[PDB]
Amino acid sequence: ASSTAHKQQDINHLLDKIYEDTKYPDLQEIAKNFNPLGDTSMYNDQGAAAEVLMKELNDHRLLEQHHWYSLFNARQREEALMLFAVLNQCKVWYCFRNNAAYFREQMNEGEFVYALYVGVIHSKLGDGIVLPPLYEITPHMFTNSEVIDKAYSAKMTQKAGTFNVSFTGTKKNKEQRVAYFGEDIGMNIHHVTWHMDFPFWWQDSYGNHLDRKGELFFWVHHQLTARFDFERLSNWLDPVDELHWDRIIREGFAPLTSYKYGGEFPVRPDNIHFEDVDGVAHVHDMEITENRIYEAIDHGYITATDGHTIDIRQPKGIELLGDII
Amino acid sequence: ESSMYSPNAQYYGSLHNTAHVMLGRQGDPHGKFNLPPGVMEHFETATRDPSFFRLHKYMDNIFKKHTDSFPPYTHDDLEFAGMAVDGVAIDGELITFFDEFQYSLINAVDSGESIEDVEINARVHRLNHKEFTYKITVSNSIGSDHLATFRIFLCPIEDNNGITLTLDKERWLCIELDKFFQKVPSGTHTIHRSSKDSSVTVPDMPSFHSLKEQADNAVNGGSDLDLSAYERSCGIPERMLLPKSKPEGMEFNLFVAVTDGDKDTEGHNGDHDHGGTHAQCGVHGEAYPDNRPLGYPLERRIPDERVFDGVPNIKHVVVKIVHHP
Numbered sequence: 001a002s003s004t005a006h007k008q009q010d011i012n013h014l015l016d017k018i019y020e021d022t023k024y025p026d027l028q029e030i031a032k033n034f035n036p037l038g039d040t041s042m043y044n045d046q047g048a049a050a051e052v053l054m055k056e057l058n059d060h061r062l063l064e065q066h067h068w069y070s071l072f073n074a075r076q077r078e079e080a081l082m083l084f085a086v087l088n089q090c091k092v093w094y095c096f097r098n099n100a101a102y103f104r105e106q107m108n109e110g111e112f113v114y115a116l117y118v119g120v121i122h123s124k125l126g127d128g129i130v131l132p133p134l135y136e137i138t139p140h141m142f143t144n145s146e147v148i149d150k151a152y153s154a155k156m157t158q159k160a161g162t163f164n165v166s167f168t169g170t171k172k173n174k175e176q177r178v179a180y181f182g183e184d185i186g187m188n189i190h191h192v193t194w195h196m197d198f199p200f201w202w203q204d205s206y207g208n209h210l211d212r213k214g215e216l217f218f219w220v221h222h223q224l225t226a227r228f229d230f231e232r233l234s235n236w237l238d239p240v241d242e243l244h245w246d247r248i249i250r251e252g253f254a255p256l257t258s259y260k261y262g263g264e265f266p267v268r269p270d271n272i273h274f275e276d277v278d279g280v281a282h283v284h285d286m287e288i289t290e291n292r293i294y295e296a297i298d299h300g301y302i303t304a305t306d307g308h309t310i311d312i313r314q315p316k317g318i319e320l321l322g323d324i325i
Numbered sequence: 326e327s328s329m330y331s332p333n334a335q336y337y338g339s340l341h342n343t344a345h346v347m348l349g350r351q352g353d354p355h356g357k358f359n360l361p362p363g364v365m366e367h368f369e370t371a372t373r374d375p376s377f378f379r380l381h382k383y384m385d386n387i388f389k390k391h392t393d394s395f396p397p398y399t400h401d402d403l404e405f406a407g408m409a410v411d412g413v414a415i416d417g418e419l420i421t422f423f424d425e426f427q428y429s430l431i432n433a434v435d436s437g438e439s440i441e442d443v444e445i446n447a448r449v450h451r452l453n454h455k456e457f458t459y460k461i462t463v464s465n466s467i468g469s470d471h472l473a474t475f476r477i478f479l480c481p482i483e484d485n486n487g488i489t490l491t492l493d494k495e496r497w498l499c500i501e502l503d504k505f506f507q508k509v510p511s512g513t514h515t516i517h518r519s520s521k522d523s524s525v526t527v528p529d530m531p532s533f534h535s536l537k538e539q540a541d542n543a544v545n546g547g548s549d550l551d552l553s554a555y556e557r558s559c560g561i562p563e564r565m566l567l568p569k570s571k572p573e574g575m576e577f578n579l580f581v582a583v584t585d586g587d588k589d590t591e592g593h594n595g596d597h598d599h600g601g602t603h604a605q606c607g608v609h610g611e612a613y614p615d616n617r618p619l620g621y622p623l624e625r626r627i628p629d630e631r632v633f634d635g636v637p638n639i640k641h642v643v644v645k646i647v648h649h650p
């Protein structure tokens with residue numbers, strides 16, 4: 001039951017038709033009858049993570065199904081990580097599979113998919129599993145709205161079809177010349193998977209340290225930026241400018257993409273100044289934060305909570321900067 | 326412009342000429358710094374300034390509102406009955422390059438009393454092109470030889486974004502390459518026209534040194550100087566007949582309209598000497614030899630390209646221009 005074949009099959013089934021109740025009777029039975037609190041010896045933490053999540057569920061404090069999910073939303077992330085924490089404590093596959101089946105039917109689908117992916121990646125139980133490409137598990141997040149609408153039409157008419165995607169914007173938009181870079185479905189999987197492998201929410205109490213993570217954070221994004229500029233150079237364009245909090249964002253964007261639940265992704269006009277975002281930050285807060293990071297760089301040390309100096313004039317300095325940035 | 330032909334300068338002012346001064350003085354608009362007039366305030370220098378072309382496109386769009394107000398030409402407006410353009414081809418490759426040109430700076434320096442001149446020259450790199458010949462095959466089924474006006478334009482096929490332009494979107498971008506009057510005999514015949522003979526262009530000016538030598542040689546020895554071999558200085562330089570294009574080559578539409586030379590030159594003398602620069606510089610001391618509106622037949626809106634395609638005496642073909650760096 002812990003064989004790679006069965007674990008892979010289990011994961012395939014859990015991720016199938018993710019917006020609907022599971023169509024697999026064996027997963028249905030588990031979701032109905034399994035008790036995450038029913039055997040604390042299943043877990044390396046004596047059952048604590050399961051208690052934490054079940055209390056949120058039983059108190060009706062979890063995000064509803066059929067709702068957008070953003071990893072950058074603090075509360076939604078906290079909920080996804082409560083399920084990750086349970087999966088991460090399972091000693092044996094049946095604990096992992098049964099909790100995943102149980103919470104698939106109780107939790108928001110975006111949170112569930114996120115937690116299951118990082119759970120597989122960061123548990124030794126996940127070794128050998130190949131995660132399906134997210135562009136087939138949640139295609140809305142990788143497919144423009146026009147093609148999704150054709151897929152909806154194919155389903156409404158019960159007729160199979162294959163539909164061509166053809167990049168956002170018009171030829172009048174010079175930025176479209178390089179749309180094949182950032183819209184490539186594999187480039188997007190690269191990016192999501194890097195962050196799943198090296199999550200900003202990681203704590204070593206989850207089981208292990210992620211070596212040089214802050215420096216790898218700098219490097220992977222430096223390479224994304226440098227690779228994009230090489231596409232611009234290939235297409236008779238100048239390099240990208242850098243963002244400034246007090247200057248206009250020249251290039252707007254119309255995603256022409258939609259959530260499965262939540263509506264169309266919002267458009268940004270050309271040539272707009274940053275505005276304060278209610279519930280997030282003031283633009284001035286971003287400037288102050290930037291200033292404080294540059295203060296550390298130019299001091300050669302990061303300032304600890306009690307004021308003492310943390311030396312960054314050494315090879316680990318770039319990593320510590322990644323940690324704080 | 327305005328000119329002294331304006332019927333009401335008190336009311337309409339002098340938009341274009343005042344604009345030259347407004348633009349030219351923007352480096353010192355209040356005279357605080359005592360700077361001299363800008364390059365826009367001399368016809369010798371105005372085109373050096375990039376804003377010259379922004380100003381003149383602005384002015385061009387004023388004229389275009391007027392030319393766009395007239396009804397599009399019809400088939401009957403445009404047809405030269407019994408005259409068909411069967412083929413348009415070029416003998417010789419269309420190739421541009423840069424070469425070197427020298428002129429004397431002696432008049433710029435100060436000569437003393439009893440101080441021998443020394444030769445002081447400037448050498449400039451200038452665009453140029455290879456000679457070529459139009460081959461325009463025409464079928465005259467009128468029943469007798471007829472005077473025809475040959476109107477030759479170069480038109481863009483696509484814009485800088487790679488978007489294919491409609492004829493209406495091309496016409497105002499087309500550049501005049503030639504206009505000439507020629508008797509077309511009954512039957513099918515190929516008209517040949519050298520690039521060197523364009524009525525849009527004139528050759529490079531003879532140098533001051535060459536003019537002095539020829540005048541002095543003629544005066545010394547009682548030799549009738551005759552320079553009837555040179556042209557006026559008004560006209561696009563022959564060397565700039567073609568746009569630079571790209572080393573990879575670019576394709577353009579070569580547009581040829583063959584129109585009724587009798588109608589076009591009525592009230593003048595069609596088969597007479599009109600000099601070498603009548604297209605834009607007219608004929609010294611004579612009426613302008615072509616009765617058609619300047620830009621004919623491209624100067625009115627063409628909302629329906631079928632009208633032009635149905636006219637046998639109009640034809641365009643694709644040509645390629647290559648720059649040799």
Ligand SMILES: *[C@@H]1O[C@H](CO)[C@@H](O)[C@H](O)[C@H]1NC(C)=O
Pocket residue numbers: 164
């Ligand atoms: C979609 O693309 C394929 C191959 O590129 C082509 O054969 C097919 O005709 C395209 N369909 C449409 C509607 O353009």
Ligand SMILES: [Cl-]
Pocket residue numbers: 513514515
């Ligand atoms: Cl012939």
Ligand SMILES: [Cu+2]
Pocket residue numbers: 191195221
């Ligand atoms: Cu990232």
Ligand SMILES: [Cu+2]
Pocket residue numbers: 341345381
């Ligand atoms: Cu002017």
Ligand SMILES: [Mg+2]
Pocket residue numbers: 019020021022065105
């Ligand atoms: Mg459900």
Ligand SMILES: [Mg+2]
Pocket residue numbers: 281285286289
């Ligand atoms: Mg902040």
Ligand SMILES: [O]
Pocket residue numbers: 371
């Ligand atoms: O001008």
Ligand SMILES: [O]
Pocket residue numbers: none
């Ligand atoms: O001008």
